[PDB]
Amino acid sequence: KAVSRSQRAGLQFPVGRIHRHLKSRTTSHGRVGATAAVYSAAILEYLTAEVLELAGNASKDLKVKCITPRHLQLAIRGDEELDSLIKATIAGGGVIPHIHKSLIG
Amino acid sequence: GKAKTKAVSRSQRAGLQFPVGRIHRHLKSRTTSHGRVGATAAVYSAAILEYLTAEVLELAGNASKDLKVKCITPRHLQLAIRGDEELDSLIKATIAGGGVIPHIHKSLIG
Amino acid sequence: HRKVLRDNIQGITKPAIRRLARRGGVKRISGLIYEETRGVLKVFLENVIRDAVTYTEHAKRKTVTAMDVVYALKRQGRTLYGFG
Amino acid sequence: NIQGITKPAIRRLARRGGVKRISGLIYEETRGVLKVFLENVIRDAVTYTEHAKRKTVTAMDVVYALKRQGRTLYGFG
Amino acid sequence: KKPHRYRPGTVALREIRRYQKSTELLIRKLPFQRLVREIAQDFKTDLRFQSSAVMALQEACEAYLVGLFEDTNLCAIHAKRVTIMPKDIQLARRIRGER
Amino acid sequence: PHRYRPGTVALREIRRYQKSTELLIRKLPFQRLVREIAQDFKTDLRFQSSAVMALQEACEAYLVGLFEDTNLCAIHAKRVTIMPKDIQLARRIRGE
Amino acid sequence: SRKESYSIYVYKVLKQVHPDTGISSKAMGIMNSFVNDIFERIAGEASRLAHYNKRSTITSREIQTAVRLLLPGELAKHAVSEGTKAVTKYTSA
Amino acid sequence: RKESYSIYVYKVLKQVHPDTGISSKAMGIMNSFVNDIFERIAGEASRLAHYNKRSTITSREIQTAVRLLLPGELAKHAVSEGTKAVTKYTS
DNA sequence: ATCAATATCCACCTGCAGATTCTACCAAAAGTGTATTTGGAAACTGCTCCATCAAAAGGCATGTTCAGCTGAATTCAGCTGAACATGCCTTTTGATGGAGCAGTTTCCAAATACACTTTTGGTAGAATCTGCAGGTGGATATTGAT
DNA sequence: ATCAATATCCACCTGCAGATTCTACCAAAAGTGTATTTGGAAACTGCTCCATCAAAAGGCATGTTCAGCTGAATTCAGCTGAACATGCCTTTTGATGGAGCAGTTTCCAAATACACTTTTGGTAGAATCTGCAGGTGGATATTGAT
Ligand SMILES: [Cl-]
Ligand SMILES: [Cl-]
Ligand SMILES: [Mn+2]
Ligand SMILES: [Mn+2]
Ligand SMILES: [Mn+2]
Ligand SMILES: [Mn+2]
Ligand SMILES: [Mn+2]
Ligand SMILES: [Mn+2]
Ligand SMILES: [Mn+2]
Ligand SMILES: [Mn+2]
Ligand SMILES: [Mn+2]
Ligand SMILES: [Mn+2]
Ligand SMILES: [Mn+2]
Secondary structure, eight states: OOOOOOHHTOOOHHHHHHHHHHSSSSTTTEEEEEEHHHHHHHHHHHHHHHHHHHHHHHHHHTSSEOOHHHHHHHHHTTTTHHHHHHHHTTTTTTOOOOGGGGGGG | OOOOOOOOOHHHHTTTOOHHHHHHHHHHHTTTOEEOOOOOOOHHHHHHEEEEEEEHHHHHHHHHHTTSEEOHHHHHHHHHHHHSSHHHHOOSSEEOOOOOOHHHHHOGGO | OOOOOOOOGGHHHHHHHHHHHHHHTOEEOOOOOOHHHHHHHHHHHHHHHHHHHHHHHHTTOOOOOOHHHHHHHHHHHOEEEEEE | OOGSOOOHHHHHHHHHTTTTTEEEEEHHHHHHHHHHHHHHHHHHHHHHHHHHHHSSEHHHHHHHHHHHTTEEEEOOO | OOOOOOTTTTTHHHHHHHHHHHHHSSOOHHHHHHHHHHHHHHSSTTTOOOHHHHHHHHHHHHHHHHHHHHHHHHHHHHHTTEEEHHHHHHHHHHTTTTO | OOOOTTTHHHHHHHHHHHOOOOSSSSSSHHHHHHHHHHTSTTOEEEEOOHHHHHHHHHHHHHHHHHHHHHHHHHHHTTOOOEOOHHHHHHHTTOOO | OOOOOSSHHHHHHHHHTTTTTOOHHHHHHHHHHHHHHHHHHHHHHHHHHHHHOOSSSEOOOHHHHHHHHHSSSHHHHHHHHHHHHHHHHHHHH | OOOOOOHHHHHHHHHHHOOEEEEEHHHHHHHHHHHHHHHHHHHHHHHHHHTTTTTEEEEHHHHHHHHHOOHHHHHHHHHHHHHHHHHHHHH
């Protein structure tokens, strides 16, 4: 009976699919070990969980149910490691408020 | 079967100095699974590389002869690249041993 | 067969530039900023669009897709999340 | 060991940068900057080194670390 | 009975708080689309655009300009001003490695 | 006794070091620093000398460029003297 | 036609960390872009590592070094821990 | 036995400046430069092929890569030289 | 602002140590000939989106007035940083072993690939389910004129 | 240093846009069997680094003197913000053709595969050639006295 490799690795992210994707982005005649896809899946799953944890925290401190681009932006820009890892523009996320002291009346 | 036709390298056939066959092999080793490399792709790549090499060597040899010396140095390469708008925009890498293009901001001169 | 498009950089109005500066935390804006900002914006747009169209023409399309813009932004070091 | 990057060496670097006058607090500040810079490059270089299961950091390891940080270096390949 | 007036800068700071708390796009949407089409058609004529391509372009342009204004403001404050001026933008872009 | 006025030798030094290309940090303290830093990552590391030399070329090019940007910031404030706030402004705008 | 995405997995992870929270479609789009970005960073550096050391197989070793190269500090430590755990549990089957 | 571009760089040099030589450290810089541009073009050509769901890197991918990666006038001349080379190679 | 005095810079020089170039061999790579496959181009066509136009009301751009307060201009003192003599120590330079890694070759157990087949996890579109955007109004805080 | 004006903060409310589930299929994941590749253990071997040792010079540490630059203080004209009248053009949604992407099928030009020959590029030592260490003499620049 078929057992999914995701379940075998104790993961939510799809190990087999990620294996196909790895296999289609390595050098010519390149091979990919199975546990390479298991490790990659675990990495992606962990980073997703970290970002979602922070974004749900911002979402719950604003008294709403759903994570929005805004919450993603507050979460990523508010954590120094995530901020340094993700330099991309978060569409619809705006800015973290800040007024330099020499400008307030 | 007495005579073979003389072997002509793909470089020579394309009128290039840069090695078409070697570049074709590198191109095949940078392709994805089941990737192919076209016949003319390595010739195009070879020509691009030769053109850019020729441009920087031209400018650096000009700086080399305008300094009354035989050999192009890192310094001449750096002077040539930083003094050319397009090359400076294309090549942001550090040229070890090339120093900087001399310049003092006007408000610092006595 | 649309009307000729001319001078549309002027559609980036002074209030729009001011709102952008405000989100940037700017409190006071010289009168010369607006033209300067239009200039900067135009260059930025040209570069991005020039690459997007290159991708479009490579794919033998006549429609610029969101992916083409995303790839052009990535190639310019201004990666964008949320469109592909 | 950071103090082995002496004040005259920092001044020479500033001079190549076209600097005419240097505040006394610059030297310590510069050392801090350099330390961070060096750490990052070295952190990646030795990473490459342990991936190859070597015990000698090569010039290639350094060049790859600098390229991966957007600071490509020509002439040591 | 004199009409109420806020002092110069009180409304500016209110506007900063308002637009920093929100996430909407700040450039009008049809004028931006006209700009994108005018530019794109001087590269290749009768191009079409998906709606999402124009919107992706606007998100990028606005994120770029907000960032540029953050840096420009740092330069203006550095010179002990509260007013951004062209020299501030030019200094920010020079250090960014643009132009 | 001869004295140059403050700023003449500084400008002479600028022209001197901008026309030259040698390394400006002493080699032994820099190599000592490199090894000290590396030992908090992996024990009994060895280095090719060319690895240390590449590191020194990189660090010196980085610091020279940083000083160019720092000087632009000092000049922007109508000064000729670079100060820590100048370095900090340059590094912030650079995204460091 | 059927375009694949990471949405169902992102939603599963969300429910694990915040059983109470949902996600808008535009934030899901941001998450999909993020996962694909990190995947191409890892895959690029893992193939590069393979070529520097002249292996032809991308193994979990290339993935682990890529993660150390690409991830800051604490993130890398924790990521390496989750990856190792998953690999040892997958091979124990 | 390590490959390099030195003999070809020297050939191009003798074409543009027959009287001039090149130091070994400058030859090393030229080698780094050539390898750098080559992996930029190859990376972008491979990406172009994959965006459009193809497996072959052709000279068309290389040409678009050159348009994407090279500034303005340089790109124009590069596209000319490559085209010239291909036309002489297929003849 | 021309002198006379003083200091540094910058060509030019030679001789020789070392860097460049040349020369010859030989693994490895490029090329050829010949056979065989296949990715993708071409030609259809279905059928999404895309361009353009339309309507109408109000949200917002524009252009103006007027005055608060900012940037700019100027002065100047004190205090920092440049320049310099002096003298000491760190770095540099040159040499010598040998310890310990890299690099290379060989070689299987172990890993991965691939065709075929079975099976279901994951997707598109529809059907349900329901937060949250805005809309409104009162408490609190901030602001600017007295 | 007591208020009127105005904004902000923060609950409360609901309908429908959008978040989540449901539904039906099917693309691709997983199992099996068999073929092919390869990572890495084993056993070497020159050859790079490392450790040690030594002398001496030049580069740096230090202390002194003072010039000039930075920061503070002050004044003010005009520039930019706040507020308002006015009216236009942006917004939102729908229609209408139809352009052009997608999806599908077929078949070569174009690519790979494989055996074998020819060619070349890397390497190391010899043979040449050249920058460079110092030294000099004139060009140029700085400094203080009138
Ligand atoms: Cl200005
Ligand atoms: Cl400071
Ligand atoms: Mn036009
Ligand atoms: Mn067959
Ligand atoms: Mn086929
Ligand atoms: Mn009007
Ligand atoms: Mn002021
Ligand atoms: Mn005084
Ligand atoms: Mn099912
Ligand atoms: Mn609300
Ligand atoms: Mn030869
Ligand atoms: Mn000579
Ligand atoms: Mn000399």
